[PDB]
Structure formats: C-alpha cells, structure tokens
Design a protein around this ligand. Structure first.
Ligand SMILES: CCCC(=O)NCCCCCC(=O)N[C@H]1[C@@H](OP(=O)(O)OP(=O)(O)OC[C@H]2O[C@@H](n3ccc(=O)[nH]c3=O)[C@H](O)[C@@H]2O)O[C@H](CO)[C@@H](O)[C@@H]1O
Ligand SMILES: CCNC(=O)CCc1ccc2n1[B-](F)(F)n1c(C)cc(C)c1C2
Lengths: 694, 13
C-alpha cells in the first residue's frame, strides 16, 4: 500500500540495527512489511537480524520471500549465503555468493563473504584474492581487512607487516569506541600486538553475541543445587567440548574423566560433536560416568535444560571461541559454577564464565586484569597431555652407532626383548647402543630402500615413515604401535653432523621478529639447520624468501610435511633443540617435543598463550630454558648448539624429568583438579561469588 | 567458522 512509508520504517530499522537495538530493528522491519508486504529489502533486512538472533529457518523463509519478490536482488542472495553457511550448507552459500556476484560484480560484501568460504575450505590464496577484490571495491571494510590479515598470517606473508598491525589496532579501537562487534576474532587476537584491554574487550563483545541468541528463548534463571545431598556427596562435573574424538583436546585429556575419584565426583561429558568413530570418542564415552551427545539437541534451551536436569555443580567450557563452541549453553547458566579449562588459551571476557583454570606461571597475579574470570590455579601447570598412555613406546629408546642420541632411533613396546636377542648391545649413562653390525646395515638398508618393515630374530622392525601402511590406528595415536619403529635424520633430509633446531607449530605462530631471532641463532651456530613444517605448504616459500633476505641459504631451513600424530611426536627425538614461538607458544606441540626428550627454549610474554611453554618447562623443572628477553633466548639456543656437553646435560634432564616431574602425570593432575573443584564448590556452598583460588 | 558481513539494504532514488 505505501512503499514510501515502509521505506522510512526500513531506514529507521537500519539505524536501530547499527546502534545495536536489534529488538527495535525487528519491530520496525515487521511494521514496514505490514505497510508494504512485497518490500523485498524489508524481508532481507529482517532476515539478517533474525540470523543474528539464531532464528536461521525464519531468516531463510524471509530471504526466499525477498528473492521471490525480486529475483535479481543481490543483497538478499549474499545475506542468504551467510545464513546457509552458518547452517553448514557450504554448497548453497557458494551458489548464493556466486549469484550475488553474477548480479553485482562490484558487490564488496559478497566478495568478502565468498572469500570466507575459500578461507574456511583451506584455499588461502583464493581467500586473499577475493578479500583483496572486496577492499579494492570498498577500501573502508573492517571485516575484509581483518580476515585478510589473518589469511596473510597463516601463509607468513609479512608484506608491510608493522603498518598492517597498526591498521588492525586502529580498526579494533574504532569498533570498540563506536560499540560495534570487532572484526578481529578473539581467538585470532592472540596473534596481534593488541593491549590486554583490547583483547579482553574483543572477547567480551563476542561473549555478548551469545545473549542475542539466548534472549529470544525467554528462559528464566535456573535454580542451582546448594549441597551434594541429591548426588550422595559427589560433585557433578560437566565437561562440554566439540573435541571428544580425534582432536588435540582429546590427545591431552582423554584419560581425565576415567581417572576421576567416583566416590567424590560424578563425571558427565557433553559432546557438541557427533561420533567420529575413533578410539578417543570410544574411551571418553566408556570411562565417563555419563556421556550426553548434544550434537543431537541443537536447541541451546533444550540442551541447557538437559545439563540443569543432570544436577551439574561445575560446568567446564573446553572450547571458548574455537570451532564447535556452543557458549549459548554457558550464557543460560545451567550450573552454579562455570570454568574455562584447557581448550582456549585466553579470557572469555564473558559475563557467564566464573573461573579460568590456569597456574601462577601461565597467569601471574599482576596480569589478573587480562581476564574477566577469576584465576583458579593448578599447583604446577594447568597444561596436561595423554603422552604416557598414547605413546609409551617413546618411554625408552636405543640408537645405532654409525655416539649420537638422535641420528638413528629405535622405539618399541618390545624394544628390550629385541635388544636381549642381540649379543653386542652396549649401554651408556641409560641408552642402549647397537653397533654397526649385520643387524644395523639391514635396518639402514630398509630406510635407504624405502621398505615398510623387515624381521630380525622374529621381531617386526618398521620404517617410521610407513606407520599408516602398518597400523592406521597406531599412526593416529588411537593404539600403541606393536612393532619396533626406526626413526632417522636421513628420513627427513636432516644433516648427520650438525645441530637441528625444530619448530613443529602452525606457521601463523611465526612473525618477522621471531624468524629474525631464529636467523641470529643459526648465524651464531655454523651448519645448524631449522626444521619447520608445511603447516601449511603455501607458507614455506614466504619463510624461505624472508630467511634468504636475512642471510640464510635455502639449505639451512628444512621443511617436512605435517605427519600422522604418532610420527610427529616420535620424530621430535631427531631434533637437538626446539625453538618455541614467543608470539604464541606451542601448547600441544610443547608437550609433544618434551615427551621426545627435546629441550624447548621459550621467551614468555604476557598473554596466557605466550606463557604456556614457560609454565610447561617450570613444571618439568628446566628453568635454564626460559628467556627473559630476545638476547637471552638467542644466548640459551646458541649455548645448547655450541656446547655439546651442556646440550647432553639439558637433554638428559628433559629425558628423565618428563617421567619424574608432574608434567605428563594424568593421575596426579586429576587429583589436583579435584582439589581445585572442591575449593570452588566449598566457596560457592558457603554463599560466596567467585574469587581467585591462588 | 569465518565471520561474514550482512548487507543492510537502504532503497534508493
Ligand atoms: C586456522 C585458524 C587457527 C587460528 O587462527 N588460531 C590462532 C590462535 C592460536 C592460539 C593458541 C591455541 O589455540 N592453542 C591451543 C591448541 O594448541 P596448539 O599447540 O596451539 O595447537 P594444535 O593443538 O593445533 O597443535 C598442532 C596439533 O597437530 C599435531 N601435529 C603437529 C604436527 C605434525 O606434523 N603432526 C601432528 O599431528 C600436534 O600433535 C597437535 O595435536 O589447541 C590445544 C588443544 O585444544 C589447546 O590446549 C591450546 O591452548
Ligand atoms: C599432506 C598435506 N596435508 C597437510 O599439510 C595437513 C595440514 C593441513 C591440510 C590443509 C591445511 N593444513 B594446515 F597446514 F594445518 N593449515 C593451517 C595451519 C591453516 C590452513 C589454511 C591449513 C590448511
């Protein structure tokens, strides 16, 4: 009836949407549609705010109405693509973006949204190409600039790096001042030189999005247990994770549910992911007191009701802002105590989180300001790994004298029996050494010939590069390998007569400053090499180009492919020293390299993510590997690479202390986690709100 | 997954 009036109502709705008044936007778009039912722009604009409230099906219905009314409405197609992408319909999203760009070639938002599919598929050069098209058409485009910056970080393109970081910080500042959702993702924010205040505000605004989605449910506050009477004096602990399956989180904590004291604790595991069929999933399902698949319960209201009805005292957030998170569940507060643990190396910034489980080394008291949560300290490190259970063949080793601990390495469950079948095995202060006999030449020939395995004295001797051909489950870490495995520097092109510095982290953890520190070390330690991973492969030529410009020849940096889990951990035995990334430390990869007995040099920063390595080394008991500044990092690394007596001493310390220290003791860890859980409970039950447990 | 950008349509002329 009146397009002009509907049109004013649509514009007013748009102004309200900008101001963050989403409920008022919805009210005004709906009145525009009463005044002009066939108003395509109102259907599409309304669908977008419905998408913000998690009403994806109702959004889809309005987008389809917009396109029914206006078949070449580019905005409706690009907006509908966003809703489909969130519904995990990547195919439909692509059709929508491609259709929006068919219609309007100059549509910056649609190029940026298409870039987001390329990014999410792993196609980073194509994501870069599309983001760059978006920024050429719309130079003021925070979402495209911030996502481009993350793409450039993944592939180690440091073109104009310091000016890039300045514009990132500037965009965040402007979005925080104007009360807009920052275009920098909280998880991504750990890679950029943002103030603690900006990192915490980014987190806080993302946490606050969960409310747009739970507010439309009109759920009242839950009533919480105030004692353990209903649960027989047992504390009900709920572990909420997308990562119960073949995921690093499971490779760290798969043992902890099973190891809880069932006299004091009732363990519930809330999976946000379907069953991926792996032993990781099998074990947590079998060893938890209860296992609830919330992938089956997509409504956060019904899912939260289920947690509340189970009687949970401490609900544990293992995702934070990682893939698969359903922080909406935490936003509804189905549990009286809600704690961040292990999955996310930073603050939620979120009203609905009470505690972050951390430690004095990771999160010292003077940086409490960085976190919205109260600090809950584990006694040594909050970090834990399942290495003792997953990889017990790496508990012991033997070498072939071709005396080096890390040129040719044997590992196996039956290693001692195999060695006892040989007549000429020496020991060293202990390390068994096979001399260059018939057996040794056979083992080496297998490696040089690229053979899968041989038999010696009835014992299966397997090529460490061929584990997936031998036992696919042994390759993933789902089972212990049953053969004796040979690992050699020759398998990876590493020099026999020079120091190997390694870093097995995603390349996005490297910045120019870090590669310059590494170059400084290599130039002080002749013939040494840096061993890095194709993580991903497209990052490799960038690193090489930067390293060559710093004076390092291509042959000083050795790249390997990312390996199946068991080979990645096993081959860390071939390194002399791990050089930790100061920007964001190795977390999982720190535990991995230490389990192989490789010393790791670290420079802790201020962020949780920049201090995990120092916390791991403190728990291990190797303070000599923690640097106070860049000069000290370079000095420690150079000393380990030039003084072979000191190297041997530091390597022995790590080799012994990975067993004797608490670092990999999941039984002691679980016992200390239980102490902390009952201190949180006792504090809540006496009627206190959260406080630091330090 | 990567965040996307919704386009607010204002109708024109
Ligand atoms: C593509 C987007 C990524 C992104 O933007 N993130 C940037 C922010 C990083 C912040 C740090 C963080 O999230 N840390 C958590 C993470 O531990 P991690 O050591 O950083 O990462 P991974 O666990 O992914 O480490 C690599 C995994 O792959 C295994 N590996 C490695 C090399 C190889 O050749 N083969 C192989 O299998 C390696 O064993 C490991 O499993 O995740 C942890 C677990 O959830 C968190 O505890 C940690 O804080
Ligand atoms: C055999 C070849 N396959 C691999 O290299 C395994 C790891 C891998 C496969 C595809 C990708 N990544 B990535 F490096 F983890 N990766 C990272 C860290 C970011 C991106 C874009 C990727 C893409």
């Amino acid at each position: 009836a009146c397009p002009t009036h509907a049109d004013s109502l649509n514009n007013l709705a748009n102004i309200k949407r900008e101001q963050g008044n989403i409920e008022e936007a919805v009210r005004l778009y709906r009145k525009a549609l009463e005044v002009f039912p066939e108003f395509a722009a109102a259907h599409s604009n309304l669908a977008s705010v419905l998408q913000q409230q998690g009403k994806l099906q109702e959004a889809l219905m309005h987008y389809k109405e917009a396109i029914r009314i206006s078949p070449t409405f580019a905005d409706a197609y690009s907006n509908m693509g966003n809703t489909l992408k969130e519904m995990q319909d990547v195919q439909g999203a692509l059709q929508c973006y491609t259709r929006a760009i068919q219609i309007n070639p100059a549509f910056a938002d649609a190029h940026s949204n298409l870039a987001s599919i390329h990014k999410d598929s792993g196609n980073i050069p194509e994501a870069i190409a599309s983001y760059r098209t978006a920024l050429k058409l719309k130079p003021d485009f925070p979402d495209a600039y911030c996502n481009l910056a993350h793409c450039l970080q993944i592939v180690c393109d440091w073109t104009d790096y310091d000016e890039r970081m300045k514009k990132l910080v500037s965009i965040v500042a402007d979005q925080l001042e104007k009360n807009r959702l920052p275009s920098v993702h909280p998880h991504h924010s750990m890679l950029y030189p943002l103030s603690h205040g900006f990192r915490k505000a980014i987190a806080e605004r993302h946490g606050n999005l969960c409310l747009d989605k739970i507010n439309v449910l009109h759920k009242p506050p839950y009533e919480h247990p105030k004692d353990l009477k209903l649960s027989d004096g047992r504390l009900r602990v709920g572990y909420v994770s997308s990562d119960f399956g073949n995921h690093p989180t499971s490779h760290l904590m798969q043992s902890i549910p099973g190891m809880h004291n069932p006299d004091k604790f009732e363990v519930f595991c809330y999976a946000l992911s379907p069953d991926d069929g792996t032993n990781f999933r099998v074990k947590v399902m079998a060893e938890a007191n209860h296992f609830i698949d919330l992938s089956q319960i997509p409504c956060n209201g019904k899912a939260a009701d289920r947690i509340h009805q189970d009687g949970i005292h401490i609900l544990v957030n293992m995702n934070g802002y990682t893939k698969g998170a359903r922080n909406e569940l935490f936003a509804l507060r189905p549990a009286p105590i809600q704690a961040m643990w292990l999955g996310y190396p930073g603050t939620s910034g979120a009203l609905f989180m009470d505690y972050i489980i951390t430690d004095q080394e990771t999160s010292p008291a003077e940086v409490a300001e960085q976190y919205s949560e109260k600090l809950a300290y584990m006694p040594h490190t909050f970090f834990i790994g399942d290495h003792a259970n997953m990889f017990p063949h790496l508990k012991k080793k033997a070498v072939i004298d071709f005396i080096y601990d890390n040129r040719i390495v044997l590992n196996g469950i039956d290693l001692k029996a195999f060695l006892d079948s040989l007549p000429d095995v020496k020991i060293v202060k202990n390390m068994p050494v096979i001399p260059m006999n018939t057996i040794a030449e056979a083992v080496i020939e297998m490696i040089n010939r690229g053979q899968i395995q041989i038999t010696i004295n009835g014992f299966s001797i397997s090529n460490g590069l061929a584990t997936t051909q031998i036992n696919n489950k042994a390759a993933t870490g789902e089972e212990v390998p049953r053969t004796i495995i040979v690992t050699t520097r020759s398998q990876y092109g590493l020099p026999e007569d020079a120091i190997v510095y390694c870093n097995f982290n995603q390349l996005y953890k490297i910045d120019p400053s870090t590669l310059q520190m590494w170059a400084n070390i290599l130039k002080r330690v002749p013939n040494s090499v840096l061993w890095l991973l194709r993580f991903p492969a497209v990052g490799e030529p960038n690193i090489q180009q930067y390293a060559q410009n710093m004076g390092l020849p291509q042959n000083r940096i050795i790249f390997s492919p990312v390996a199946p889990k068991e080979e990645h951990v096993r081959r860390g035995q071939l390194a002399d020293v791990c050089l930790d990334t100061p920007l964001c430390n190795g977390h999982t990869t720190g535990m991995d390299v230490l389990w192989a007995g490789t010393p790791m040099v670290t420079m802790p920063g201020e962020t949780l993510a920049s201090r995990v390595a120092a916390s791991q080394l403190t728990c291990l008991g190797c303070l000599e590997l923690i640097a106070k500044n860049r000069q000290e990092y370079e000095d420690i690394a150079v000393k380990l690479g030039t003084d072979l007596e000191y190297l041997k001493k530091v390597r022995g310390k790590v080799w012994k202390q990975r067993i004797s220290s608490p670092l990999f003791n999941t039984k002691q860890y679980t016992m200390e986690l239980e102490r902390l859980y009952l201190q949180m409970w006792e504090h809540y039950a006496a009627g206190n709100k959260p406080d630091h447990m330090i | 997954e990567t965040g996307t950008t919704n386009t607010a349509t204002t109708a024109t002329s």
